[model samples]
Target: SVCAAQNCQRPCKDKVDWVQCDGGCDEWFHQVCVGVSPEMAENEDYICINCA
Candidate 1:
């Protein structure tokens, strides 16, 4: 699946930080690629800009 972030179609790598986008996507994303901190991504309501 593609990440919520652009140009980030890479697989959900366990080697990287992943987040469950709190928007409707509900997919795992690389926090670094998504430009979000793991600490801030704890929200069950946190959505990326595209999904926001």
Candidate 2:
């Protein structure tokens, strides 16, 4: 699937860290593109840049 972050068209792939937005969009994002570490994502709700 395509990442939901603005200006980013990176695809979600196997073995790569990624997170899904918990906000309005509920879209997938690469951890690097959204600056969200796996630990952080696991600890709290994730809001994508556009949604936030």
Candidate 3:
């Protein structure tokens, strides 16, 4: 499930909520933060953090 990892504000902890994705493991991230557009989310590559 957790296929990839990314830089976090701090080490991931179970108590605090960190940026994450919707694809299953906590790969969530913001579109703007990673310089991706919403349109990309719909494209085939779909290389969003969630996809990572």
Candidate 4:
């Protein structure tokens, strides 16, 4: 079921980890695909590297 979903360059797994981006881009990126650690992902406010 891999397709061009999320912000991933390629498709990600159906069971993907989640991280809420607070960078104003306002997109939910795949934590694993974006290299977001569990601690970062758990944070209330997180700005992705691209937007940081």
Best by lDDT: 2
Per-residue alpha-carbon lDDT of candidate 4 for residues 1-52, written as tens digits (9 for 90 to 100): 3322244655456766677676777767666666667777666677776577
Model 1 scores a TM of 0.57
Model 1 stretches with alpha carbons more than 4 Å out: 9-15
Task: In model 1, state the lDDT of residue 22.
Answer: 57
TM-score of each: 0.57, 0.70, 0.35, 0.55
Measured on C-alpha atoms, candidate 3 has an lDDT of: 0.45
For candidate 2, the lDDT comes to 0.75
RMSD of 1: 2.9
Name the lDDT value of residue 23 in candidate 4: 74
Cα deviation of 45, candidate 2, in Å = 0.6
TM-score rank order: 2, 1, 4, 3
Question: Poorest 10 consecutive residues of model 3 by lDDT?
Answer: 1-10
Which of the two, 2 or 4, has more lDDT? 2
Greater-lDDT candidate between 1 and 2? 2
lDDT agreement with native, every candidate: 0.68, 0.75, 0.45, 0.63
lDDT at 49, model 4? 66
lDDT of 3 by residue, 10-37 (tens): 3344543223355455465444444546
lDDT of 1 by residue, 4-25 (tens): 5675757655667678765777
As for candidate 4, its clashing pairs are none
